Amino acid sequence: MKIGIMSDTHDHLPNIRKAIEIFNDENVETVIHCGDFVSLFVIKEFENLNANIIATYGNNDGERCKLKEWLKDINEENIIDDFISVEIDDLKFFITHGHHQSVLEMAIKSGLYDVVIYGHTHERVFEEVDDVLVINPGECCGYLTGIPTIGILDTEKKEYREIVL
């Protein structure tokens, strides 16, 4: 009943596959990817992940059009949009690739969501501001920090734990 979080994979196939496995060798009902898969060929890797997908467009994702199409092919359920407001296990979520500072700032500070997930910065963070769970899974490629990471959230007991690759 736990969900997986990832972001900014930047075509790093190895780490993408590593991550996909991990998300399978564990429940992970669904998986959130807020960053830049970036290239189309990346989607074909996901047609090998058990959980479904809730993704958000990154500033580097050049093919938004075919990206959503291919994602649907992998599964009708899968969904991708600039922003994503949803709920799971009674929790209110708001997902978005770092990007738009203000919209992110506002979401967290609005207090209309239980959890706020985002990427873009490549800076993995996991704090709680005013009972709002703010999560940045960090960069899956690990290119800009040398530390590739993903994360798994427990919608149940609300416990998040990082996973270095």
Separation between Cα atoms, residue 149 and residue 147, nearest integer Å: 6
Radius of gyration of the chain (CA): 14
Per-domain residue ranges of the chain = 1-165
Selection from 66, 42, 57 nearest residue 95 by Cα: 57
Sequence ranges of the binding site for Mn(2+): 8, 10, 36, 59, 97, 120, 122
30-33/52-56 β-pairing = parallel
Q: What is the DSSP letter of 154?
A: E
For the chain, where are the E strands, in sequence order? 3-6, 30-33, 52-56, 79-81, 83-88, 91-96, 115-118, 125-128, 133-136, 149-154, 159-164
Q: What is the resolution of this structure in A?
A: 3.0
CATH of the domain spanning 1-165: 3.60.21.10
Sequence ranges of the binding site for Ni(2+): 8, 10, 36, 59, 97, 120, 122
Sequence ranges of the binding site: 8, 10, 36, 59, 97, 120, 122
C-beta pairs of 85-93 under 8 Å, 24+ apart in sequence: 85/113, 86/54, 88/3, 88/30, 88/155, 89/1, 89/155, 89/156, 91/115, 91/155, 91/158, 93/117
| Count of CB atoms situated within 10 Å of the CB of 81 | 14
